[PDB]
C-alpha cells in the first residue's frame, strides 16, 4: 500500500521480537563478530586463500545459496562447484583450525544479527535529517549503510557500547549522502556547509535590518575571504534547477521546454551559408597552388588554428611569401568578381 | 570529435584511436540509448497495473491482489518445492506470511523466556534444560510459571553463584583449580573425604578472572529450541555420510545451513558432541519480481493453451469464462510476435540525453527534463542496492531498498499509477513520467495531432 508504514512495521516488528539487551546480547554478538575476524584471518593463514575469499564463502553458507551469488555478483565464482571446493578444505582443517571455520560462520551470523537489532537506532537518527532533500527511506538506508560501517571497526576491548559508536558512523554516512545526492548538480561537502553557513548568516541578518541583506552584509558576517562576487555566486548554485516541464502562464496546459531555442543546429540560413562558402572556397583552393594555400586552409580549417610548423620542409620565408601573395591575389580578384565581399558573416 | 584528433568530413565514418567518437552532428546525442542494469529485477507497472493484470491473467495468481501482495512487499510464494508442512503439503503456487514463514525455515518454535532473579527460575530451568528432552507444556517452576509449551530439546545460557554444576567451559578458567590442574573433584568441599561440579557457591558473574576485569554480571536466558539434539551420531555410507561420527569426524556443515535427512538445518555446539539438527527443509520462498520472473519462464504456454481449451468448452460457465479470458493473452503470445518472459524488467532503457536536456537559462538559471530527477532516483537506488549486497546483507534493509527500487522503476515508466513522486518542496507536481510523455494532459500522440 503506502511504503513508509510497511518498512517501519517491518523492522519495528523484528526489534519488537528481538531488541538487543543493553549489555549481554551486544557483548555476545560483538565477541562473536571479532572472533570471526580472527578466525577468517587465521583461516587465510592456513589456506593461503585471500581473507576476501574466506569471507565470501562463509557468507554464502550462512546468508544465501547459489541464488544470492549469481544475481548480485555476476559470475566469477562458480555457483556450485567453486564455493563447495572452498568449504571442503575448511572441513579438512582438523580439530584445531576446523574450530575457526565453525566460529567464522557463527560470527558472521552474530554480525548480521546485531545489525538487525540496531535498525531502530538508525531510523531514530535518520528521523532528524529529514527535510534535507532526501527521502526518509533513502535517508534511513544510507544511515543503515553507516551502521554496517561501524560494525567493521568496533573494538569491544574498549568497553564503550555500540550505541554511541553507531551514532557517529551513521551521522557521517547520512550527511555525506545528503551532500552527494540531494542536488541534481552534485556539490562537494565543503560547498554544502558553505551554503549552510551562508543561509544561517542571512538568517541572523534578517533578524534586524528589515532589509533582506545586500550581498554586502553576508560577506562581512561570513568571515575572512567573503566578497559580493562570492555570495552572488554561491546562492546562484544554491538555487536548484527548475522543471523543464512546468505549468506556465495560465496552467491550463503550458509546458515550459518548448520555448528554448536551439544553437548547434544550422537554421536553414546557415546550411545555405556552408553550401556557397564551401563551394566558392573550394573553387579558389583548386585554381591555385596546393602549397601554402592548403597549408593555411588545412592548418586553419581542418585541425586546429604556427607559421614555421605550418609548412612541410620549406621554411618561413616561402610561407609568408606565398601566404601573403596568394592570399592577396585571391582577395583582390575576389574584389573584382565580388562574391565574397557580402560578408557571409 | 570530443578531443579533436579527427575534425572534418573526409573520415566521417571512423572512430578516434584514444577516445570513441564517430560523427555526424549531436543528433546522435539525442537519438542514442543507454541502459541501467538493475540489481534484483522489478516489473513494469504498465503490465502489472492495467485492469487485466497481463501477468496476473497469464500467471494464475490472484489476478490483482496476489501480485500487489508479493510484488511490493515481502509476501512469499513457494516457487518450486518446499517439503515441510504448514499442516498441509507444500503449496506449489500459494503464498504465505513472514510470521509463519519465519516459523518454518529456522525451526518450528522459538521461545527465549529468560528468568527474573538469580536463584528461583535459574535453578528450575537448569536442572531440566541441558540434556533432558523437555516435552510440550514443561512447567518450569518459579517466576509465575515459566511455560515452555513446545517440542524437542532445550538450551539455557548464563548462571550466577547459587551453585555451579554441569555448565560449559566459561567458568573453568575462573577458578583455576580445574582448568590449571585436575582439581574439580576436590572442588566439592568437605564430604569427598567421608562433567562439571564446582564449589558450594563462590562466583556470581559472566566474566573472565585474570583480575575480575572482562565481566558482565546480568541475567540468565532459558531459550527453548524445538529442535532434535543428537550427541553420538554414527557412520552409514549408503548416501554421503549424514550428520556426524562419534567424536572425531564431523561431516555436517557448521551451524547454519545443512540438509541431512528430511530434517534440514544443522547447528553445532562443540561443547558436548552435540549436532543440533533442526527439522524444516528446502523451502523456495521468494517475493518480488524475482519470484515472478521464475514463474514466467517455467510456463509452456502450449500446455496452458490446450489445458484452457478443455476448460473452455467442457465445465460450466463460471470457471470456463475465466479460462477464455486467460486464453486470449496466451494465444497472441504464441501466435505471432514475441514470447512472455520479457514482461519482467532487469534492464531499463534510458531515454536519449538531448531529449532530457540540461540547459542554461536567464541570469544563469538552468532547466532540465523532469525525467532526469527520476532517472537519478533509480540509478542511486540501484547502486545503493549493489553496495548493500556487497557490504553484507541484513534482510529487512535489502528488501526495504528493493521496494524503493521497484517504486522507482515505476516512476520513470509511469508516475501516479501507484503514488505520485515530487520534485523537492516547490511544486507538488508529478514529474512527467515517460507515460505522461506519450499520453499525458498535453502529451505526445496527443499534441501529435493537436498541431505542429
Ligand atoms: Zn578524440
UniProtKB/Swiss-Prot annotation, chain B:
Zn(2+) 1 binds at residues 1, 3, 16, 19. GO terms for cellular component: DNA-directed RNA polymerase complex. The chain holds residues 58 to 621 of 1524 of the full protein. The gene is rpoC. DNA-dependent RNA polymerase catalyzes the transcription of DNA into RNA using the four ribonucleoside triphosphates as substrates. It comes from the Bacteria. Belongs to the RNA polymerase beta' chain family. The RNAP catalytic core consists of 2 alpha, 1 beta, 1 beta' and 1 omega subunit. When a sigma factor is associated with the core the holoenzyme is formed, which can initiate transcription. GO terms for biological process: DNA-templated transcription. This is DNA-directed RNA polymerase subunit beta'. Keywords: DNA-directed RNA polymerase, Magnesium, Metal-binding, Nucleotidyltransferase, Transcription, Transferase, Zinc. GO terms for molecular function: DNA binding; DNA-directed RNA polymerase activity; magnesium ion binding; zinc ion binding.
